Amino acid sequence: DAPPLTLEGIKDRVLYVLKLYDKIDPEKLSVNSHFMKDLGLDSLDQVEIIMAMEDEFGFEIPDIDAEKLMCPQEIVDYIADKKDVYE
Amino acid sequence: SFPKYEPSRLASLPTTLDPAEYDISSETRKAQAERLAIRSRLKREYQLQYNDPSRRGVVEDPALIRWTCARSANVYPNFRPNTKTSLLGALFGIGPLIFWYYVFKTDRDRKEKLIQEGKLDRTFNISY
Amino acid sequence: MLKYIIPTMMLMPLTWLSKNSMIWINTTLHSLLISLTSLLLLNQFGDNSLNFSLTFFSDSLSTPLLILTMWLLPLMLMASQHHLSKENLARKKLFISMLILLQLFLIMTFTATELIFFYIMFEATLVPTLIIITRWGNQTERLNAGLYFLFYTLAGSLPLLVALIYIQNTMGSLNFLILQYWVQPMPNSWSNTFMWLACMMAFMVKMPLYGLHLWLPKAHVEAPIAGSMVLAAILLKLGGYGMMRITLLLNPITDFMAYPFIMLSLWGMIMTSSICLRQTDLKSLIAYSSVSHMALVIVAILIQTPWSYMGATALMIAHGLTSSMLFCLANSNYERVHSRTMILARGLQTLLPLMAAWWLLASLTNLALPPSINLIGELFVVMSTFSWSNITIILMGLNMVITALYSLYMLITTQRGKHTHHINNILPSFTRENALMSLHMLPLLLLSLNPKIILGPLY
Amino acid sequence: SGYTPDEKLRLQQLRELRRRWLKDQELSPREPVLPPRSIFAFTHVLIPVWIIHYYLKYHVTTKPYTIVEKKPRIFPGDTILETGEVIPPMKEFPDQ
Amino acid sequence: HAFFKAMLFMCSGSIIHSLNDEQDIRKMGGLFKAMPFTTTALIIGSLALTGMPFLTGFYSKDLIIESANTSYTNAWALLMTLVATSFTAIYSTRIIFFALLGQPRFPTLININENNPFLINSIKRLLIGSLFAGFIISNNIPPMTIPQMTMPHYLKMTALTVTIL
Amino acid sequence: GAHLARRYLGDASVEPEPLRMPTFPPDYGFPERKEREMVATQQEMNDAQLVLQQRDYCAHYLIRFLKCKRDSFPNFLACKHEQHDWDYCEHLDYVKRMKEFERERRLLQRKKRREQREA
Amino acid sequence: AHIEPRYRQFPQLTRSQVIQAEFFSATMWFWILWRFWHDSDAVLGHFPYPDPSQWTDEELGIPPD
Amino acid sequence: FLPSAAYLTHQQKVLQLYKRALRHLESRCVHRDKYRYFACLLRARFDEHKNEKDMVKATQLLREAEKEFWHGQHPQPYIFPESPGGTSYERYECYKVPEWCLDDWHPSEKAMYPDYFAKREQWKKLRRESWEREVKQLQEETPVGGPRTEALPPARKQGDLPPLWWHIVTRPRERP
Amino acid sequence: SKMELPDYKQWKIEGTPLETVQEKLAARGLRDPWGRNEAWRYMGGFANNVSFVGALLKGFKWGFAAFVVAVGA
């Protein structure tokens, strides 16, 4: 009952599960990138991204918080806030 | 495609189908903004009187003390004896009491007559 | 027994000619020596009751209550500091001497020869407690609480005196054996009804019964800890003892006239168990709990079975210990937070962790813990009332269920689930608190081993 | 929707503070606690066995109306160990 | 019943602690060949439900229903026990299928770890006590009643018939 | 079986009913039909404390079964032949009770329908 | 050393746990076979359940009519 | 009923209904691939009428969507074992002492843990030093007498911390 | 700290349930799935797990030999 986590490892895992998705290119997928502006997905696909990573990490984020992610850096930051990733 | 979800004293109406959140008035949005302003000011002064390291003790909620003194001390004033209060007082103070009274006299008279004859289970009835 | 009376007189000027930081040691040490002296008492054997003096005597029903009183005194004097410890030494000596004088009148009350002497010591039991709770009630309506207190008890207890002078002037002297050994069945006139109703009505006020109950909870929520524990335990179980003594007379008419008192007793037991399930202001919950348990006592007294009397006196002693404990629990949380509310102060599963077991055991004894004295007393009460009536068990079991429910809710309201994260001042558990706890609950379970003392005169 | 950038900046300051706090919670004094200072079965089920066998002869039988037993069943084709006499068995069985 | 659901609940709690305390049947589907010890434990428990002929769970339940059938029966409760026998068969089958048999669905970075001496000792010893002790205990009792032993057709076969259907 | 369907749907007349079973008096069609062997020693039946509702027929098989079960106890799988004998004797008694039911059924049906067709 | 976790892959299994598991399942089946073959025959009731007892007229006694 | 605004931006209400319908269909549908089929069919049904430029037609479809959702909902949604009402819901809450405490320990145990207590003292220095002027002046200067929000500004002035940091940063690890 | 995270462009989905549902959804006229996220939930040491009756068939794929040996004993 002690899963280890690290910031770079969970960053690479979130980047990996973003790269698994179809309509964004695996070539140009930044750590620091917008969602609505440059990646070419709407609000609906963005919340589908949210739903899939909720289903993988086992804890939801609310719609009162789902307005305001917009970039994977804050995603890694918020999930690190939930997990409190230090030794 | 449904019986439209009747509300009741247990049937809590969920916030999806209100349906008063459809024809929203602009003054109702203004009321929501005033509600946000009230909660904003109250949580602001909570975080003022809450995060002080110089402060030591409790938060001193005025509203909870207000509710408690309303619930305990503010009962007997105000009051007037109305029709509903007097009727409900006679219904909850006298009714079930006289109900148990008559059934206890009835069962006691049954027991009294059945032991007055002598055809009881007193073959051994030690612990009275 | 005057060998037990006169050192209590000698302890009265002890606080006066004790110096500073020496009142505590002298009072506590010498009152615990009085506790050994109190445990020496039980020489009583078998058939009759023992006589101590030209004046008075000890019954087998007086002795456990005298033990309870002289055992509750040092616990209480140990209890009632630190909320008056910032005030003056002369006023502290006044308070200690007032408690010792109160104890002395209580011992005269329990060990009475005659019911006139019992009446003198009855209102002497009343009066200094009101001075105590009025001078240190520490809440704004202590005035109205004491006013209600003395008016209800002196108004209910007034015709008792005239009825006792009537029993004097028509039957000779009032000493319990010659008051006994001579009685006659007094027929269904009205004078028997009024005299019976006067004496029983005075003690109905003293229990209290349901229709005159609001006497009690204001005098608990607006009293300090010493007057509250003495008030509940000693005063209400003293009224029960007084009814147990006086009820030897007027047995042929009490069958005709004793039905509606049973009625108000049972139905008010139900409604009082109902009222102390929802309320906040935790201090009131013990008071309405005491109303419930003494209504159960009153049902057990007006049914006239030896089973009933033994169960009633066991319930008396057990609930006295229980209510004094739970008063001390409420004062512990009040020393932690100056709130007196219930829904505010929460948490304390982590904080003060072994106090949780004491709160557990308190809700267990009000929950009728199944080897406790409380359950044994209520069990004999339920057995005797079902022998008296084959139909009464609905109200008894509903009292049992709701009693369990409000005792458990009283447990899990303030000390279950989550810290409120704004208290952020409280200190860990003191030595004195759990010391008072060990003084409460060890003799209760050690009586739960061998309860041969705590049953009635027909043991 | 999204953050206002003032919330982004405030978010960054408290993420720095949270990471430094949990860095401090990671303890390593390298000596964190520091103080000033068949035989099982033999004792545990031979001492109370001795005590209960001591109590369950003498006191429990000097109390006369005490521990008592529904007898083991005697059978009609056997012999008695205490007194000793044969019981008559059952008679002819047939037509099985 | 005591041996039965002691072993069953303890196997279930083993799996729930193995799978991040998620406790649910949604996202649980196919977990056979993920270590077969607990899966074997669960399926031997659920086969011992309603007494596959004839095991430790056979004797009690089946002699009870046949002894209820061959008596002054109140004509509705026997029908209740029959339909409930079919129902406990179908939800034992459904808990098997939605526990171990569908497709594997669970979060990644698994702590699925039953490399544990304590738990294999406990589950091992309870399956030993769950396969011999039913017959052993049911054999060495004094007969305190009359066994029936005389049943018609489809009155002794009826339990097996209903559980199979 | 069809006995219950006929008894609850057709007539309950020709089908006899439990707890009121002996309807005709005896020796109507017996002649000289009673043995009731029962040499199972009533006093020794008291002396061997059987369970109640077992102090009955076929008790001696149970006596021998408990006898061998006692006198060779840790032989765990010993007594089975006498066990089957006791089961077979209760099978005999159960068949005899079914014979009682069907004998009353045949008597009641045949004689009652004959006399109530031509009487 | 003991096990270490993995990422999205089928977990590995030691030969010991799988051989105990298949051993316990097969010994369950072994006990139910030797219990099912050698001695019982507990499916059938060890007795021929009779017909309507004899179908014999006036054996058990009916009167001539 | 929200922290920031008073209204809740109708697009977001549509998005809330999207997430709740998708979650209830997760609860409705096992095997995950027929689920993927049904989710893509629902997503296509939403995309049938995405670019309606009206608003009364949009909220009429919203009302009918709420009716069809409340009819076709599910009793027990698959809520996660950290979600409110779920399996855990602070399951390991047992060791959540807020760290205003631990200063009321005995100094023997405080001699046992010297490093953490000295560093707690320097955090206490950091708390007290920035508390009065910057925090109180930013709370009393930049807001209007009606505060009108729940968010607090960063201390972008020169140096030290944005206000109210103590209880927000010093809350426990959420898994002891 | 390495985990080494077995990467993308490895699945290339090809699997039977997702293939059938992509073809059905394409003939329906959508052609817009999530992606290959179920591939590690579908194949590997996965992909022909046994059915219901095979779990009870697991009981006697080894016990018959020992049973016939015990009968011969």
Number of domains in chain A: 1
Which pair of structure tokens corresponds to residue B9?
A: 């004293």
Contact between C28 and C99 under an 8 Å Cβ cutoff? The reply is no
Neighboring chain D residues of A77 at a CB cutoff of 8 Å: 11, 15
CA distance C181 to C199: 20
Q: Nearest CA to G43 among E52, E45, E135, E130?
A: E52
CA distance C149 to D30: 66
CA distance C4 to C38: 8
Contact between D92 and F41 under an 8 Å Cβ cutoff? The reply is no
CA distance G5 to A1: 12
Neighboring chain A residues of D25 at a CB cutoff of 8 Å: 86
Q: Do B97 and C425 touch (CB under 8 A)?
A: no
Q: Do F87 and E147 touch (CB under 8 A)?
A: yes
CA distance E88 to E93: 8
In angstroms, the Cα distances linking C200 to C186, C210, C212, C262, C299 are: 16, 14, 13, 12, 13
Q: Nearest CA to I38 among B60, B126, A21, B51?
A: A21
CA distance E50 to E56: 10
Residue F51 touches chain D, beta carbons under 8 Å: no
Q: Nearest CA to F109 among C13, G57, H68, H12?
A: G57
The distance of Cα C211 from the centroid of its chain, to the nearest Å, equals 19
Mutate to test the interface with H, among B40, B55, B59 (most CBs of H within 10 A): B40
Q: How many CB atoms lie within 10 A of CB I21?
A: 17
Neighboring chain I residues of A17 at a CB cutoff of 8 Å: 37
Query: Phi/psi zone of residue H7: left (φ > 0), alpha (ψ -120 to 50 degrees), beta?
Result: beta
Instruction: Provide the β-strand partners of residue C52.
Output: C56
Range of the domain at A22: 9-83
Q: Do B64 and C305 touch (CB under 8 A)?
A: no
Q: Nearest CA to F98 among E151, B29, E144?
A: E151
Instruction: Count CA atoms within 13 Å of residue C127 on its CB side.
Output: 9
CA distance C102 to C230: 9
SS3 D73: coil
Task: Verify cis geometry, omega within 30 degrees of 0, for the bond prior to F73.
Answer: no
Instruction: For tokens 């043995």, name the residue.
Output: F35
Instruction: Count CA atoms within 13 Å of residue C250 on its CB side.
Output: 25
CA distance D29 to D59: 61
The distance of Cα H156 from the centroid of its chain, to the nearest Å, equals 24
Number of domains in chain C: 1
> β-strand C56-58 against C50-52: which pairing, if any?
antiparallel
CA distance C368 to C377: 9
Q: Nearest CA to C224 among C433, C83, C77?
A: C83
Range of the domain at C351: 1-459
Residue A1 lies in a domain: no
Measured in angstroms, the resolution is 4.6
Q: How many CB atoms lie within 10 A of CB H74?
A: 13
SS3 A21: strand
Contact between C261 and C255 under an 8 Å Cβ cutoff? The reply is no
Give the largest Cα separation in chain I, rounded: 67
SS3 I35: strand
How far away is chain F from the Cα of E148, in angstroms, using its nearest Cα?
8
Q: Nearest CA to C341 among E55, F103, H152, B66?
A: B66
Residue type, C243: M
Secondary structure string (H, E, C) spanning C143-197: HHHHHHHHHHHHHHCHHHHHHHHHHHHHHCCCCHHHHCCCCCCCCCCCHHHHHHH
Secondary structure string (H, E, C) spanning chain B: CCCCCCCCCCCCCCCCCCCCCCCCCHHHHHHHHHHHHHHHHHHHHHHHCCCCCCCCCCCCCHHHHHHHHHHCCCCCCCCCCCHHHHHHHHHHHCHHHHHHHHHHHHHHHHHHHHHHHCCCCCCCCCCC
Query: Phi/psi zone of residue C229: left (φ > 0), alpha (ψ -120 to 50 degrees), beta?
Result: alpha
CA distance I4 to C242: 85
How far away is chain H from the Cα of D57, in angstroms, using its nearest Cα?
50
CA distance B57 to B17: 44
CA distance E146 to E144: 7
Contact between E11 and E38 under an 8 Å Cβ cutoff? The reply is yes
Q: Nearest CA to C61 among C75, C76, C41?
A: C41
Task: Verify cis geometry, omega within 30 degrees of 0, for the bond prior to B109.
Answer: no
How far away is chain H from the Cα of I42, in angstroms, using its nearest Cα?
10
Instruction: For tokens 């029908």, name the residue.
Output: E79
Nearest-by-CA chain H residue for B22: H59
Using a threshold of 3 CB pairs under 8 A, tell whether chains I and E touch. Answer: yes
Q: Nearest CA to H173 among D26, A13, A9, D16?
A: D26
Q: Nearest CA to I21 among H41, C297, D70, C130?
A: H41
CA distance C200 to C247: 9
Instruction: For tokens 């004839």, name the residue.
Output: E54
Q: Do H167 and B50 touch (CB under 8 A)?
A: yes
The answer for residues whose C-beta is within 8 angstroms of residue C268's C-beta and 6 or more apart is C209, C210, C211, C213, C291, C295
CA distance B59 to B46: 8
Q: How many CB atoms lie within 10 A of CB E84?
A: 11
Q: Nearest CA to A76 among A19, A12, A20?
A: A12
B/e letters for C322-356, b = 16+ CB within 10 Å, e = fewer, are: bbbbbbbbbbbbbbbbebbbbebbbbbbebbeebb
CA distance C227 to C203: 20
In angstroms, the Cα distances linking H103 to B17, B54, C339, C349, C354 are: 51, 15, 24, 19, 20
In angstroms, the Cα distances linking E125 to C184, C260, E38, E42, H84 are: 77, 65, 13, 14, 39
Q: Do C422 and B108 touch (CB under 8 A)?
A: no
Residue I4 burial (C-beta neighbours within 10 Å; 0-12, 13-18, 19+): exposed
Q: Using alpha carbons only, how large is chain B's radius of gyration in Å? A: 30
Secondary structure string (H, E, C) spanning chain C: CHHHHHHHHHCCCCCCCCCCCCHHHHHHHHHHHHHHHHHCCCCCCCCCCEEECCCEEECCCHHHHHHHHHHHHHHHHHHCCCCCCCCCHHHHHHHHHHHHHHHHHHHHHHCCCCHHHHHHHHHHHHHHHHHHHHHCCCCCCHHHHHHHHHHHHHHHCHHHHHHHHHHHHHHCCCCHHHHCCCCCCCCCCCHHHHHHHHHHHHHHHHCCCHHHCCHHHHHHHCCCHHHHHHHHHHHHHHHHHHHHHHCCCCCCCHHHHCHHHHHHHHHHHHHHHHHCCCCCCCHHHHHHHHHHHHHHHHHHHHCCCHHHHHHHHHHHHHHHHHHHHHHHHHHHHHHHCCCCCCCCCCCCCCCCCCHHHHHHHHHHHHCCCCCCHHHHHHHHHHHHHHHHCCCCHHHHHHHHHHHHHHHHHHHHHHCCCCCCCCCCCCCCCCHHHHHHHHHHHHHHHHHHHCCCCCCCCCC
CA distance C411 to C407: 6
Q: What are phi and psi of D29, to 5 degrees?
A: -80, -5
Contact between C204 and C263 under an 8 Å Cβ cutoff? The reply is no
Residue G64 burial (C-beta neighbours within 10 Å; 0-12, 13-18, 19+): exposed
Which pair of structure tokens corresponds to residue G11?
A: 């977990």
Give rounded-to-5 percent helix, strand, coil for chain D.
45, 0, 55
Task: Verify cis geometry, omega within 30 degrees of 0, for the bond prior to E115.
Answer: no
Mutate to test the interface with H, among A42, A45, A51 (most CBs of H within 10 A): A51
CA distance A17 to C149: 75
Residue G45 touches chain F, beta carbons under 8 Å: no
Q: Nearest CA to C288 among C273, C298, C299, C278?
A: C273
Closest residue to F99, CB basis, from G46, G53, G62: G53
Q: Using alpha carbons only, how large is chain A's radius of gyration in Å? A: 13
Using a threshold of 3 CB pairs under 8 A, tell whether chains H and D touch. Answer: yes
Q: Nearest CA to C219 among C202, C204, C236?
A: C236
CA distance C352 to C429: 5
Which pair of structure tokens corresponds to residue E133?
A: 């002790």
Query: Phi/psi zone of residue H67: left (φ > 0), alpha (ψ -120 to 50 degrees), beta?
Result: alpha
Q: What are phi and psi of H26, to 5 degrees?
A: -55, -45
CA distance A70 to A75: 8
Which pair of structure tokens corresponds to residue E4?
A: 């039965």
How far away is chain E from the Cα of H51, in angstroms, using its nearest Cα?
35
Q: Do C425 and B100 touch (CB under 8 A)?
A: no
Secondary structure string (H, E, C) spanning A26-49: CCCCCCCCCCCCCCCCCHHHHHHH
The helix-helix angle for C306-336 and C237-246 (nearest 10°) equals 170
In sequence order, which ranges of H89-135 are alpha helices (DSSP H)? 107-112, 114-129
Neighboring chain H residues of B32 at a CB cutoff of 8 Å: 6-7
Residue A44 lies in a domain: yes
Contact between G22 and E39 under an 8 Å Cβ cutoff? The reply is no
Neighboring chain I residues of H26 at a CB cutoff of 8 Å: none
In angstroms, the Cα distances linking H133 to D5, H112, H146 are: 24, 36, 21
Contact between C96 and C8 under an 8 Å Cβ cutoff? The reply is no
Start-to-end CA distance of chain H, whole Å, equals 32
Q: How many CB atoms lie within 10 A of CB H81?
A: 17
**DSSP result, F3-46:** HHHHHHHS-SSSS--TTS---S-SSSS-SS-------S-HHHHH
Nearest-by-CA chain I residue for E93: I52
How far away is chain D from the Cα of H82, in angstroms, using its nearest Cα?
21
SS3 G7: coil
CA angle (F106 as vertex; F104, F108 as ends), nearest 5: 65
Using a threshold of 3 CB pairs under 8 A, tell whether chains E and G touch. Answer: yes
Closest residue to F39, CB basis, from D71, D77, D90: D90
CA distance B84 to C87: 51
Contact between F63 and D90 under an 8 Å Cβ cutoff? The reply is yes
Instruction: Count CA atoms within 13 Å of residue E95 on its CB side.
Output: 17
Q: Nearest CA to C197 among C234, C222, C160?
A: C160
Give the largest Cα separation in chain G, rounded: 95
Task: Verify cis geometry, omega within 30 degrees of 0, for the bond prior to D29.
Answer: no
CA distance A40 to C99: 84
Neighboring chain A residues of E107 at a CB cutoff of 8 Å: 56-58
Contact between B67 and C279 under an 8 Å Cβ cutoff? The reply is no
How far away is chain E from the Cα of H131, in angstroms, using its nearest Cα?
42
In angstroms, the Cα distances linking D85 to A87, C302, F41, F71, G37 are: 84, 65, 18, 17, 46
Instruction: Provide the β-strand partners of residue I35.
Output: A21
Nearest-by-CA chain I residue for E94: I52
Using a threshold of 3 CB pairs under 8 A, tell whether chains H and G touch. Answer: no
B/e letters for C48-84, b = 16+ CB within 10 Å, e = fewer, are: ebeebeeebbbbbbbbbbbbbbbbbbbbbbbbbeebb
CA distance C42 to C38: 8
Secondary structure string (H, E, C) spanning B87-109: HHHHHHHCHHHHHHHHHHHHHHH
Q: Do I59 and G38 touch (CB under 8 A)?
A: no
CA distance I18 to H32: 10
Neighboring chain F residues of D71 at a CB cutoff of 8 Å: 49
Domain containing residue A51: CATH number: 1.10.1200.10
Q: Nearest CA to H139 among H159, H118, H158, H163?
A: H163
Neighboring chain E residues of F54 at a CB cutoff of 8 Å: 143, 145-146
CA distance E69 to E78: 7
Contact between E52 and E60 under an 8 Å Cβ cutoff? The reply is no
Which pair of structure tokens corresponds to residue C327?
A: 């008063």
Q: How many CB pairs under 8 A join G and I?
A: 44
CA distance C328 to C229: 8
Q: Do F18 and E144 touch (CB under 8 A)?
A: no
User: Which residues of A are designated catalytic?
Assistant: 42
Contact between C102 and C128 under an 8 Å Cβ cutoff? The reply is yes
Residue G19 touches chain I, beta carbons under 8 Å: no
Closest residue to B17, CB basis, from H70, H131, H167: H70
Which pair of structure tokens corresponds to residue C148?
A: 């209600």
Structure solved using which method? cryo-EM
Nearest-by-CA chain G residue for F91: G47
The helix-helix angle for C191-206 and C142-156 (nearest 10°) equals 160
